[PDB]
Ligand SMILES: *[C@@H]1O[C@H](CO)[C@@H](O)[C@H](O)[C@H]1NC(C)=O
Ligand SMILES: *[C@@H]1O[C@H](CO)[C@@H](O)[C@H](O)[C@H]1NC(C)=O
């Protein structure tokens with residue numbers, strides 16, 4: 001008898017802008033016509049929690065409860081409660097979840113690092129790493145665009161926010177993208193956008209192409 | 225007694241992120257006891273309002289109503305209805321606002337333009353000019369940010385979007401920022417963010433500095 | 449019960465060089481048998497106003513008065529008056545108009561951004577007209593001497609300048625293909641504004657406005 005609550009984080013909002021919060025019911029015996037509800041602080045009602053899933057063939061419990069909310073009732077501090085009643089535990093169970101205010105917010109420095117000359121001199125495939133350093137709290141959304149056209153998410157891989165070594169309560173994350181290096185010899189655009197809550201407009205874009213940190217070599221200084 | 229619907233445009237529900245619909249009435253007698261009621265299509269209860277304007281000099285009056293809603297509720301077009309009831313009206317007066325759907329969407333190709341070499345010869349004050357072209361519908365937002373932090377909202381002037389010459393349904397707007405010749409000749413990178421309802425993260429940005437017209441491989445100088 | 453005129457602007461003089469006075473009536477309920485009378489300050493007669501107007505489509509009336517007066521009395525302030533004699537009024541009403549600091553624009557053209565000459569399909573040249581007062585410059589665009597069509601450029605209105613107190617700015621964009629602008633193509637923009645001494649300024653940009661003309665560096669393989 002556990003009831004968990006999976007909330008929507010910044011990666012889940014910003015990918016969709018359609019905040020849906022999920023109440024997970026697990027650890028019972030396999031009974032049908034489950035009774036769950038999603039309620040506010042003031043006891044009202046929401047969208048129905050359709051798309052019930054299958055149960056478990058290892059005989060644990062499976063029920064989800066969704067509700068589509070819009071964002072300001074999730075940030076202002078309204079607690080959202082999933083209520084659970086059934087045949088095993090027919091007593092009213094309350095699982096409350098909200099957004100836990102009381103944490104700082106610093107802005108992510110983003111550096112997009114171009115592929116190293118050891119990697120390119122094989123001429124097989126290059127990987128570009130967007131480094132999203134310095135920020136707090138967690139839950140950043142890193143995604144990649146190839147000149148105003150979002151790349152397929154089978155291609156990049158974002159890390160998880162692991163806490164920074166020398167910085168106190170901050171984080172970092174990474175996101176690598178494997179370009180075929182034949183596409184990097186034309187060297188098009190490759191911008192990395194990073195959606196955090198502490199930015200001014202909440203979206204930062206950095207870009208790197210084949211000639212970005214290249215210094216000037218041929219300093220011709222003719223004098224007369 | 226004329227009524228005016230001022231629906232929040234995309235500029236207004238982007239720069240505050242606090243969608244806030246308002247409606248006004250002019251040509252009204254200078255008497256107290258205003259009621260301006262907002263409602264939905266189904267008829268729930270909305271936020272109240274205060275801060276009613278003072279008298280007109282021409283023995284007339286104007287009253288104002290402010291509320292707050294959700295953004296998906298705008299994009300769903302629940303035509304919110306504001307009704308005037310007073311001790312000087314003969315009849316109920318009303319307006320129904322919505323989202324005017326039935327429109328295309330198009331991407332603003334921002335281009336940031338660095339000042340004319342004629343103007344960095346007089347040596348007082350440049351004018352950097354973000355050109356925001358190609359979009360549809362109207363109502364783009366442009367904001368200038370120098371080194372993360374935003375510049376003062378009266379050091380730059382966005383125009384109003386005007387229909388582009390050959391392409392029919394598209395528009396263009398401009399925005400100019402004035403710097404002096406000492407701020408430009410250090411470089412400062414001067415970002416120009418463009419907020420528009422057809423961009424994937426709804427915020428794009430460009431940047432220029434005085435080393436952008438350079439060819440940055442050769443530094444061909446010339447001394448005397 | 450009002451009458452508003454359409455006085456000549458600088459764009460109304462300079463585009464046509466056939467300056468004219470026009471005035472329309474409003475808030476008057478619809479009727480017929482109206483007379484509008486264009487009349488000078490000292491009362492002498494004018495060009496005979498013709499081309500009678502129609503009713504308003506909002507249950508009211510409009511009426512038009514035409515005239516063609518040359519520039520010396522308009523630039524000095526002949527307070528031109530268009531009298532309405534209606535049926536709503538047995539009191540005929542005289543509505544006068546007039547032509548009421550002077551700085552000069554600094555036209556700078558700006559050649560298209562190098563981000564735009566990678567698409568190779570459109571380029572936008574942008575005649576920035578900053579500094580002037582009063583409003584309503586007339587900007588137009590001449591290509592190789594012969595003036596370009598009025599459907600290949602736009603121009604905003606004046607909009608008051610950010611830091612300057614009572615001075616304006618304007619803009620005008622002219623769209624060319626990349627094959628046009630990458631083959632020479634002088635593209636003069638000419639501002640027409642009264643506080644200029646000659647009353648016209650014109651400036652030019654081709655592709656080669658910036659290479660420094662002593663040296664000429666190339667990058668060969
Ligand atoms: C490039 O040449 C200029 C021309 O005199 C010289 O002053 C400068 O030191 C050189 N820069 C570098 C990085 O070598
Ligand atoms: C580039 O050339 C300028 C021109 O004098 C010179 O002052 C500067 O030091 C040079 N810089 C580099 C990085 O080559």
Ligand SMILES: *[C@@H]1O[C@H](CO)[C@@H](O)[C@H](O)[C@H]1NC(C)=O
Nearest residue numbers: 656659663664665666667668
């Ligand atoms: C320099 O001049 C030569 C001949 O006039 C020409 O071939 C070359 O293209 C010029 N340089 C550039 C960058 O166009």
